Amino acid sequence: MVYSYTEKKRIRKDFGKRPQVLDVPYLLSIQLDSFQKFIEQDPEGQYGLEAAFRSVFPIQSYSGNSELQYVSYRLGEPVFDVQECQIRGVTYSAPLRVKLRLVIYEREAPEGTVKDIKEQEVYMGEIPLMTDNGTFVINGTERVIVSQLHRSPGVFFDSDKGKTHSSGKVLYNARIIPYRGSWLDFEFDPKDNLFVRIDRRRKLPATIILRALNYTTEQILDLFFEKVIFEIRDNKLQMELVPERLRGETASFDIEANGKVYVEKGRRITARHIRQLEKDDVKLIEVPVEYIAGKVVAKDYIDESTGELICAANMELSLDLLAKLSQSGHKRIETLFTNDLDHGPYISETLRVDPTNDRLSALVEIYRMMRPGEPPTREAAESLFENLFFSEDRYDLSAVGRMKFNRSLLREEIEGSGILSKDDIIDVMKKLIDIRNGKGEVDDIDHLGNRRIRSVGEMAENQFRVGLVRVERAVKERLSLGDLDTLMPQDMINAKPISAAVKEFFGSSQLSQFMDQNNPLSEITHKRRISALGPGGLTRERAGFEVRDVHPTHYGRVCPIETPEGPNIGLINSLSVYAQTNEYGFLETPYRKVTDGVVTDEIHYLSAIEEGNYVIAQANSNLDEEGHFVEDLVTCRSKGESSLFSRDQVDYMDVSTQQVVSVGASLIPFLEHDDANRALMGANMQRQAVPTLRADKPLVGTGMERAVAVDSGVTAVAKRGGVVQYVDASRIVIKVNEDEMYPGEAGIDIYNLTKYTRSNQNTCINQMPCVSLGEPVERGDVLADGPSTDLGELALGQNMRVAFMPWNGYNFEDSILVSERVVQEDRFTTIHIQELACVSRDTKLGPEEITADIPNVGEAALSKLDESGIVYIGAEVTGGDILVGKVTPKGETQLTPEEKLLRAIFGEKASDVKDSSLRVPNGVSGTVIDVQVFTRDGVEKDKRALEIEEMQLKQAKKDLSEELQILEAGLFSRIRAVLVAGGVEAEKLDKLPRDRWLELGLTDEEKQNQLEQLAEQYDELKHEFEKKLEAKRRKITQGDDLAPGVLKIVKVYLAVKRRIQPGDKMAGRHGNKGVISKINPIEDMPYDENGTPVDIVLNPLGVPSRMNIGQILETHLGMAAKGIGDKINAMLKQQQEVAKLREFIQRAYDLGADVRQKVDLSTFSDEEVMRLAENLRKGMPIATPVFDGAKEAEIKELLKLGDLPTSGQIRLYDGRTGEQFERPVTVGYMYMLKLNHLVDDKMHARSTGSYSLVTQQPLGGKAQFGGQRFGEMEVWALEAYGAAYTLQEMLTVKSDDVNGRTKMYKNIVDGNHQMEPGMPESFNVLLKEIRSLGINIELE
Amino acid sequence: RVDYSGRSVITVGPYLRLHQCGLPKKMALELFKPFIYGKLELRGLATTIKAAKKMVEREEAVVWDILDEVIREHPVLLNRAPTLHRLGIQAFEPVLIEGKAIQLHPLVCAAYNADFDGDQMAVHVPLTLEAQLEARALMMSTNNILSPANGEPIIVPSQDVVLGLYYMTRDCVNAKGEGMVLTGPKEAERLYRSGLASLHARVKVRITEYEKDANGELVAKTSLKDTTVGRAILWMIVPKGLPYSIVNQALGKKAISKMLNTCYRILGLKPTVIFADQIMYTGFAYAARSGASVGIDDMVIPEKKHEIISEAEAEVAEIQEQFQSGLVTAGERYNKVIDIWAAANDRVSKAMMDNLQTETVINRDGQEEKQVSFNSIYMMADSGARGSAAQIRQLAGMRGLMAKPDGSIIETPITANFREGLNVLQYFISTHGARKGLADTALKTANSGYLTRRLVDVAQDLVVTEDDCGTHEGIMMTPVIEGGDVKEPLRDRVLGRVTAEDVLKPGTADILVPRNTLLHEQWCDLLEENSVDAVKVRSVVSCDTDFGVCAHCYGRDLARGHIINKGEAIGVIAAQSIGEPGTQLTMRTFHIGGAASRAAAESSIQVKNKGSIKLSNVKSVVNSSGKLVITSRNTELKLIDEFGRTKESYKVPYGAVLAKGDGEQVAGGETVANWD
C-alpha cells in the first residue's frame, strides 16, 4: 500500500532493519478505555455505575416492608459543548437519568402488594465527561487524573525482617487486604505462636479468634493437625507406622515389626535402617508403655468410669496419668506427632496463652479490644464479629480479591464468594504454618504481579459508591420513618451526596490536577503517569530505600528512565508505548509467539506472572526469511537474569526495542550512545520547552512523534475526509466524498479552529491549516497544526548552526553563546498570555457599575477606555494603567446630601472613593487578546460584550447558513432536475425561481406530489433551520452560571512577545541545559571556507566531563542532513529540472542497506514528493530509532555523500582577527530547546514594598517587593566572614526596625551614612508572644 | 526577606577584572534611585525631589552619565542562595553591560561553587560606609584568596585554562621553525607573522632570570635555555622573578597551579596579585585560538578488547562448567567471576590507555618517530582540565558493574562501549545505578546542611579576645606515618603554629623558647636537620586565656595575610564551613570512608624507607621455630632510617609472627609479618 497521503508533504527518512509488525496503539486507551467502561450498559454487571447501583440496590428499610429495585441508569447530553464550555469556564457534566423503581409490601400480609411503582427519572448529581484527548473540564481547567499504583487485593506472603529490631532473624507475616474495610494480618513473635492483628490493634492469639469462629480444640488439633493412630487393647499399645513421615529416632529398646526387628536397641537410625522398614510393607506394631509419656495427646479422651475432665486435649501426659487413662477402658487414643524437622508446634502456645476458651467470651474480649471506652454488652458481639470478619458489606473482595485469593490459595475456579470464609482463613493459617515451617516461597513487595493500577473508572466508582451509600442511609431513614410511602423516590433522594462526592472528587484530589502545557509532549506524557501517592502506596513523606528501587518487573511496562528527578524519586513512572492494562488492573506488554523453529506473526500481551516463567529473546536478534534464527545460541531471559539459550528455549520475542522506553524519552535519538543519567536529565527537560513562532520539524528524529502529534489531540484532524472547499484561519470546511456517507441529514463536515488562547502555563496555542484548497483529504489526516507542531510532526524546539569551540572564555562549563543572527531571524520568539480578572461587585451599599468613569484620575486613562465600555482590543497597556474601569458605592449618601447629589463628587455619582478599578500590576506590559467579561441572565444596559455577543450570532448564523445553503440549494437543484420533461425551460428556469411556477402541472402526479413535496420539505428545512437557529441563539444569549458572590465577572486575556534573551536558558536533547553568557555580534563569529559565521558556541569539555555521547553524532548527522538540504537548495538556485534532482533525491532515500520501505517517484513522480523537495529544501528529515539508530559507518557515508569532509571537521577562520584556528574543528547542526527559565520571569528586582502585619516582614517574592531572602546559611556566612555590621543591621534595620529605615533614608540626604541599630519589632513579636504566654517578661 | 535585590541569573564575563561586576543597566538605576536623587541634588541638575523623580521616571539619557559616575566605585556584594562558607558573599566593582543577566568571573564561580545550569542568584546592595567599605577592605575576591579550610589559596584555573596552557606549553618533533635565534619578543613576530608554530621543540631562545635572594632587591640574570615558543609566551605573563620555564612551564598541568602557589608565596599583594589574570587572558585567548574539538576520530577503541572479553568469557564459562560439575561453590564462583571481570576490565583500561598515547601518530618526513599525541581526550586526561581515567574508561573500555537493590557486583557485565550500541538490559542496570546515584547525591545535601546546623550551633562561643597569655601547654607534633607510605608530612602540621620549645635535630640548638614559626623558619628547620619529626607546638585547644581564645597560641592565618588579630571567629566559622564540603558528597559507595577491613599491617606489615624496624612498647619473645612474637598485646612496629626520623609506624598486635624481630633492616615495601 504505502499510500502516505498525509505524510507526502514531508517523508521522514527512517533507519534500522528491525520492522514493527504491531502498530503504535492510540496510547490513550487507559483513560479512554477506563472512561468508556465507566459509562456503559451491560447485563453482566461490569464495574461502574451499574455495579454500584446493583451493589447498594435493592434499598430496603428494616422491618419496613418496602424495597427499592434498580432500573440502573442512562446518561444524557450535557448542556454545553467541549470547546465552548472551556471558553465559558464552567464545569462540564451531564445529568443522570433513569431513577430506580420502588416497591410496597402489605404489613402483616404476606406477598400483598397494593400497586407496582414505576416512577419517572429524578435528577441526582452531575456526572462529568472526558474529552477525546483524555482531559476533564471543570471551571475551565484541564483536570487530568494521574494513574494510580498500589497493592492488589489478595493473600500476601511477606518477609518483613526488621533491620532496626536487632534480632537479626526473619519474622514472617501474612496479611489479607480487601478492596475496602478492615485489614486482617498475622504476626509472629519469638515465642513461636501465631498472632492476629486487625486494624493496628494489639495482636490476639489464634485460639481466641479461631475460638470466636466456633471451633473447639478437638476440631483445632484434628483439623489443623493429624491425629495419627493409637490403639490399646488390654494395654497392647499397637500403633501404625509412619516411616516416611519423620527422619530420626531414639531407641532405648528393640522394636519388632511382624516377627522381625526393624530397628535394634541402640542400632543406627541411618537410612540403611530406615528404608528396610520403609520400602517394605509394615502394619501396626506393639511397643512398650514408656513411649506414651513422651508423646502429646491429640484428641480429647475422658475416662469412661467417671465424668471428670482429666486427660483433656493439648496437654502433656504424666507417668502416673498413663495408669489412670489406659485403665479407664478407652477405645482409641490419638497422639500428636510433635517433632520438629519440616514442621513446628504451632497453635499450642495460642491455646495455652489464650484466655478465652469459648466463642462468647472470645467475642466479648475482641469487642473490648476493639472499643476501649465501653465495656461489651454481649448483645452486639455477634453483629460485630460477623460484620467485622465475614460479611457482604464490609468485605468487598471484588475481583482480584478472589482471583489472587484462589491463586495463592491454589484453588481451581476463579470466581468465589466476596466475603471471608472459615475454611479460607484456616487455609491461610495452615499455609502460613508452612511458611513458619520453612517450606514454600515468600512474595516480593516490589513485584508488580502483586501490584495493580487504578484509574478514573475504579476511583470514581469508589467515591461515587460511597456517596451512593450516604444516600442509602438517609433514604433508609425515610423509608423506615413511614409505614407505607407512595411515590417514595421523589423527595427522598437528595442530590447533594452524589454531587458532593463526584464534584468534590474530580474537583479536589491529590491525583486529579491541571497540567502545565508545553508542547503536546508534556500533555501526553503528563496524561500517562504512574503515581504511588494519594491513598495507599505512600510509605513515608521522604527518604525510603527499597521502595524507590527498580525491580526486574519494571522492564517492559514502566519506563525507568522517565522519573521525577525532584524530591520524590522512583515513585512517578511512565507506561510503555505498547503497554496495556489487564482486566484486574495488571499491566501486560507484547511478546511475539514462536512455534517450533519458526516465528509466527501473532503477538500476545503478557503480564509479569505469565511472562515470568516463559523465556523471551533479547530485543535485537538476527532474523532469517525462513523464520529460523541465524545464530544458534540467542541471548534470552527467563527470570531475573539473561543468558545465551538454545533456539528451542526461546518462547517469545520483544518485537521493537522501544518497549522499555516511554513517550517522553523515546523521542531522544541515539539513546544507546548517550549515557542513561544525562538521558534521564534530558527526558526530564523535554517537558518545559515553550512553543515558538515558527515550528521547524526536527531534522534528526525518531518517527514516533509522527504518531504522538496526531494521537495527542492537539492538532486539528479531519473526519471523513474529502475535497476541501473553503479555508480560513478561523474555520475550515471540507466537502465529504460520496464513497462513505450517511443517507440522512446530508451536509458536510465543518471545523472551527481555535485562535490564540491562554493555557495553564501562560503559553500560546493555535492551529494553522496545512492544506491550501481543493486537496483530497483521507480519514485521519491532520488539517491544522497545534502549538509547536509542523505538518502534523511535533517540533517543540528550533535547529540552528552549531560549532564546538572555546571562544575567548565566554563559554565556561555549561554556559551557552548565541549569535545575533538568530536574534535577527525572529527564532525562539514566543508569546506569553497572562489573564487579568477584576471581579468584585457584591456590596450591601448598592451595585457596582463597570467603567463609565475613572474617579480621581485624569483623561489619560479615559482616552484608552471607552465612554460606556472598556479599552480598545489590542491596545498597549504599560505599568499601572487601568485596563477595565470598575467603581464602588463606598460612602454613597451623607450629609450635604451626597455632596449635593454628587456635585462635589464631580461626575462619578457613586460619591467618591472607588478603588474597584483593575489597575494592572507594575512590571507587566503587553497587548490584550480578548475580553470575555461575563454573561448573565436578565442583564441590560451593558455596552461591554456587545461586540462578541453579536459576533457569536454572526458566526453561528454564517456557518449554519452555509449548511442551510447546501441543503436548500441541493433540493432546489433536485427540483431543477425533476422538472425536466415535465415542462422545462432553460431560458426561463435560468432567470426565475419557482421552476416555472413550482414545476407547473405536467402530469398531475408531479404537480401535487413534486410541488407539494418541494414546498413541504422546503418550508420544513426553512422553518426547522430558523427554529434551531433561535434555539442556538438562546443558548448564546442565556449565558452561564456566575458565582453568587458577585453580580458581574470581568476577565481579560493579554499577550506579550518574549524572544531570545541574554540570560535566558537553553537545553539539549541529551541533557545539557545552561544559561547564555552574552549574545555576540555576527562579525565576531568564526566562519568556514565559505564565510558562514556560526550561530551557537558550546563547551566540548562537557562531552567527556558530563558523559554526553549523542552530541557528536547529533551535530555531525545534522550537518549531513542540512548538507542534503543545502545541495538540493543549491539545485533550486540553479533551477534544475525535476528529474535531475529526482535522481539525487531517490539516492538520498534508498542510500545505505535497506532500513526502510520507502521508494521515490512511486506515485506519478511528477507531483507529491516532487513538491516535497521544495518542502525539504531547507533541511532533510532524518530519523533514527531509539536503540536501532544510525551507526557511524552510515553516518560518515551519508555525510561523505553530502560533499562534506568525512571526518566531520571543516577548516575554520576567525571572525574577529581573520586568522585560522589550529587543527580542524568539529561543527554540526543540533536540535536546541527554549524553556520557561527566561530571566524576565525568573528575575525580579525590588527595593522597598508592601509589608505584613505579622512581625513587619514583607511577604516575599512575586510581590514586586522584598530582597528575596538571606537565610540562616547567610547569617552564618556573615558570622563566617566576621562582619558584625552586615548581619546585625541585616536582621534589624530592614524589617524589624522602622527607625533603621526612616533614619537610613533620611541619612541618604546629605549622606550621613549612619544606620540606626534599633530595637527589633520582630524581637518584640517574641517578647509579645511570651507576654501572651503565662510567663510574661518585662524590661527594666 | 532583606532588601535591595535583583535576583539575577549568573552569566560569565571572561574579561575586565577578577573583582568587578557585569551589573546590567536594567538591574541598575532600579536600586540606585536614592543615589540618583541625592546625585541630582548635590550636583544640582534637578530642582526638587519630585522633579528628580520625574527625571528618573522619564528615563532621560542624562541620568545614565551620573549613574555611571555612581556605579563605578559603588560596589555590589554577591552570593548564591545555598550558601556554605565565608567567601559566598563577595564585593565587586560594577560596570554596565547590555542584557538582563550578570557576567561573573569564572574563577570566582568555582569559589561560589555556582553552576551555569540556571541556579538562581541573590543580588544585594550594601549600605554606605560600613557595608561598602567593609566589603571593600575585607570581602573583596582578590583581598580574600586563602581559604581557612584547606589552607592553600583556592583558585580553579581549570577547563580551558588547563587545556589552553597545556596546548601552550608542549613540544613537537620536526614540524616547522626548528630553532630560533630571537629570544624575548619571538611571540609577536614569530608567532603572529608566519612559519612558527605555537609550540616548537629545541629552541635556543634565552630567558632572563631574576633572583630575590638579595635583601629588598632583585638580582637579574640571563642565559640560553631550551624552551618551546608557547612557554616563551607564558613567560611574558609574570615579569617578576621565576624559575624561568623550569618549574614555570612544565607540561601545562595542575603544576601551573603549583607555580601559581609558589608565585603567590612571595609578597601576596602586588603584581603577584595584579596581572596574574593574564594567565587567564592567554589561557582562554590561545585556548580559543587552539579550538580543541571532540569527535568520532577523537576516541580510540583498543583491538585487545575483543580478546580480553573473549578470554574472560571463556574462563567464566569454565567456572560455570565447574559449578555445573559441582566442584566449585556458588559463592566462590560468583566472587571469582567478579574477580576475572574486574581484572579483565583493568586490562581493557590499560590497553585503552596504551592506545591513548602510543597509538596516536603524526606523519612527518619518514613518520617512523611520530610525535606526542594531540588528541583532546588525552589533553584533558593528562592536563586535568576535566574528565578522569574512569570516565574515559567508560567512554571506551568497560563501564564497571554495580547493583543498587542488591549491593553486589552483577554477573552480567557490560561489554559494549558508548560508541557501540548498548544492550537494553545494560541500559536498564545503568539507569538503575544512575538513579541510585541521583538519590544519594540528592540526599547528601540535607544531611550536610544539618551537620552544619549542629556544628555552627556549637561554634558560636568564640570571642577570641586576648592576644597572647603565655601558656606552657602545647601538643606534641608527630607525623601520622600510617600504612605503606606516610599520608602527610609533619612540616605541614607544624607549619604556622606557636612553639613552646620544639627542638629540631638531636637537641643541638634549633628554635628558642620565644620564637614564632613562619614559613621561612619552619621550612628551614624542616629542610635542614629533618631527622626529628616531633616538635612541641602550642595549639588553640590549650590556652591560658580565661575568656575567649589567644590568637598567638591558636595560630596566624586567614583569607587575608598572616598575623591574625582578635575578634575573629577563626576555627569556629572557618571549621564549621570547612566540614560542609567534606560531608557534601560521599566518596564512591561511602564504604571507602568506612572500615575497609583490609589494611597494610592487617595483612602484611610493610616498611616505607629502608632502615631498622623496631618494636616500641613491646616485649620481644623469641620462639623455637626461629620467628619472633610480641609478648604484650598492644605493640608498635616502626621503621627508623639512618637519620632517626620515623618513616612508617603501625601498631603491632599480639600474635604476629615476624621473620626478624629486631636488629635487621627493611627496604621499601618489606613485609615483616603476615596474618590472615
Residue numbers in the entry:
A (entry chain C): 1 to 1340
B (entry chain D): 346 to 1021
From the paper:
To investigate how transcription is activated and how the AAA activator interacts with RPc, we obtained a 3D reconstruction of an RPi consisting of RNAP, σ54, the same promoter DNA as in RPc, and the PspF AAA domain in complex with ADP.AlFx. At least two distinct conformational classes were identified and the best class refined to 5.8 Å resolution, while RNAP was separately refined to 4.9 Å. Despite the lower resolution of the PspF ring, it is clear that the PspF hexamer is highly asymmetric and resides above the DNA with L1/L2 loops facing DNA and RNAP-σ54. Importantly, there are significant interactions between PspF AAA domain and DNA, both with DNA backbones between −24 and −12 and directly in the groove downstream of −12, where the transcription bubble starts. Significantly, there is density connecting RI helix to the PspF ring, in accordance with the established role of RI as the major interaction site for bEBP (inset) (Bose et al., 2008). Immediately downstream, there is density for a single DNA strand followed by a double-stranded DNA (inset), suggesting that a partial transcription bubble might have formed in RPi, in agreement with the observation in the RPc structure that the DNA strands are becoming distorted. First of all, the σ54 ELH and RI, which form an obstacle for the template DNA strand to enter the RNAP cleft in RPc, now move upstream in RPi, thus removing the blockage for DNA entry into the active cleft. The concerted movements of β and β′ pincers result in the widening of the cleft by ∼15 Å at the top in RPi compared to RPc, in preparation for the loading of transcription bubble and downstream DNA into the RNAP cleft.
